[PDB]
Amino acid sequence: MKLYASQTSPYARKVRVVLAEKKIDYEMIEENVWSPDTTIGRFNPLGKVPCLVMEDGGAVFDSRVIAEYADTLSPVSRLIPQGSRERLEVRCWEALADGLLDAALLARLEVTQRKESERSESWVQRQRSKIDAALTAMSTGLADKTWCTGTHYTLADVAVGCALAYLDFRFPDIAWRDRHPNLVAFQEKIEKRQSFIDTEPPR
Amino acid sequence: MKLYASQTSPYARKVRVVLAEKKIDYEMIEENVWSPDTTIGRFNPLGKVPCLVMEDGGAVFDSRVIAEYADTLSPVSRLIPQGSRERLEVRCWEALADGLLDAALLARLEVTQRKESERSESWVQRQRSKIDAALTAMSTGLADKTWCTGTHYTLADVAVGCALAYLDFRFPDIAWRDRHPNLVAFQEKIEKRQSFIDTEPPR
Ligand SMILES: N[C@@H](CCC(=O)N[C@@H](CS(=O)O)C(=O)NCC(=O)O)C(=O)O
Ligand SMILES: N[C@@H](CCC(=O)N[C@@H](CS(=O)O)C(=O)NCC(=O)O)C(=O)O
Numbered sequence: 001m002k003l004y005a006s007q008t009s010p011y012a013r014k015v016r017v018v019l020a021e022k023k024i025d026y027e028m029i030e031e032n033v034w035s036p037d038t039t040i041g042r043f044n045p046l047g048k049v050p051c052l053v054m055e056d057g058g059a060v061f062d063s064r065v066i067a068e069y070a071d072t073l074s075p076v077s078r079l080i081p082q083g084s085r086e087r088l089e090v091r092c093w094e095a096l097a098d099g100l101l102d103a104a105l106l107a108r109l110e111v112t113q114r115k116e117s118e119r120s121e122s123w124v125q126r127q128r129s130k131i132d133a134a135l136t137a138m139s140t141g142l143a144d145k146t147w148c149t150g151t152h153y154t155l156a157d158v159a160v161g162c163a164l165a166y167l168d169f170r171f172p173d174i175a176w177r178d179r180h181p182n183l184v185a186f187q188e189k190i191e192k193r194q195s196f197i198d199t200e201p202p203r
Numbered sequence: 204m205k206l207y208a209s210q211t212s213p214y215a216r217k218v219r220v221v222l223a224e225k226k227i228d229y230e231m232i233e234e235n236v237w238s239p240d241t242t243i244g245r246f247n248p249l250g251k252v253p254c255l256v257m258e259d260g261g262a263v264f265d266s267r268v269i270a271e272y273a274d275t276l277s278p279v280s281r282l283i284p285q286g287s288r289e290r291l292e293v294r295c296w297e298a299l300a301d302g303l304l305d306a307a308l309l310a311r312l313e314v315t316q317r318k319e320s321e322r323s324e325s326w327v328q329r330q331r332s333k334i335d336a337a338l339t340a341m342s343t344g345l346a347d348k349t350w351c352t353g354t355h356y357t358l359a360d361v362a363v364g365c366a367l368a369y370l371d372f373r374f375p376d377i378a379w380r381d382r383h384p385n386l387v388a389f390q391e392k393i394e395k396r397q398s399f400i401d402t403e404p405p406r
């Protein structure tokens with residue numbers, strides 16, 4: 001299997017963490033999707049990473065679909081629970097984290113993909129407000145628990161960890177660590193996992 | 204259960220189609236998420252519809268999470284297959300359709316949420332190129348089959364149908380019907396389903 005990804009992509013980091021936790025071997029292929037020379041469209045018509053390309057040539061996207069499928073590929077470190085209700089809880093956590101990332105990417109892309117004369121203050125403020133709200137919800141949801149859903153590490157934790165680390169990396173001005181002590185304790189723990197250690201974004 | 208949604212939202216339409224197919228009763232609550240008076244943030248910190256609010260007050264998002272959960276709530280009209288590989292196929296179709304919608308929404312929002320002096324031609328062209336590519340992939344993937352995954356109607360078909368109907372509604376200039384006869388035949392069939400008939404977008 002081949003994973004088209006980048007070392008900075010937080011959605012791709014989620015998938016890489018899952019693959020590491022599951023001990024699934026794969027070839028990592030760094031692809032710059034913002035280059036006019038990108039070939040990602042051979043595999044993902046949406047032009048995005050991550051994209052997993054299977055032995056047979058079948059292409060899998062997006063990160064949620066890849067994560068769900070990877071969890072079935074080994075009995076090692078089950079990350080998505082069996083129960084429908086328990087699965088709901090984990091997948092909603094993942095949607096919350098991914099949604100925070102969607103807003104953060106839009107806020108970043110407003111700068112990287114537009115001339116100053118093409119930018120909107122109100123749009124960026126909207127996206128930054130979603131990030132703030134998502135952070136508050138993550139802190140409210142985690143509450144006093146060990147992990148997002150209680151006793152066990154799941155894809156919820158992976159997704160949240162990737163989101164918070166992305167803010168550390170790209171948005172150090174968003175001071176979530178001051179605001180939410182329970183998220184700080186969570187992140188301090190999760191970043192000690194081998195899967196996180198091995199997938200830190202460069203720079 | 205309460206579904207916070209709008210009658211135009213294609214992501215919400217996907218959920219409403221699933222709920223109709225499954226014969227699950229729910230209260231529909233129209234919510235304008237673009238109004239400064241929106242209260243959607245009580246339930247979905249990302250500020251988006253659809254959002255399903257359960258009897259207990261628990262909030263579920265996004266559309267993929269709601270669709271997956273709704274499929275478990277009744278044995279009527281199973282829309283997501285049991286097999287991991289078969290599930291992968293359906294969920295990747297859903298990601299493709301949702302991704303087409305993401306690009307279409309961005310292209311629309313460039314106009315509705317920005318003054319002309321805040322707009323980017325290159326960004327809109329990028330998004331429109333994703334739509335074209337996604338359409339080609341949908342046509343390639345469906346090929347000569349009855350439904351997206353072969354013999355049976357699944358969430359893949361729901362998602363694709365919602366996407367194509369959204370383009371008819373909001374982007375009549377994107378002439379997919381001329382380009383892809385197999386998608387035309389697909390859409391002509393799916394729009395005869397009661398769930399689609401009852402959820403057409405107004406105007
Ligand atoms: N729903 C998808 C989002 C992936 C995405 O936007 N990836 C960005 C790169 S970012 O992670 O650095 C991407 O590929 N953007 C390229 C584009 O939008 O043209 C998922 O969950 O995998
Ligand atoms: N990943 C989510 C996307 C929903 C969405 O963007 N919904 C739009 C409304 S559109 O369907 O008319 C939305 O709520 N936008 C409000 C905002 O982004 O502030 C899902 O699959 O449900």
Ligand SMILES: [Mg+2]
Pocket residue numbers: 149150
């Ligand atoms: Mg619990």
Ligand SMILES: [Mg+2]
Pocket residue numbers: 352353
């Ligand atoms: Mg098949």
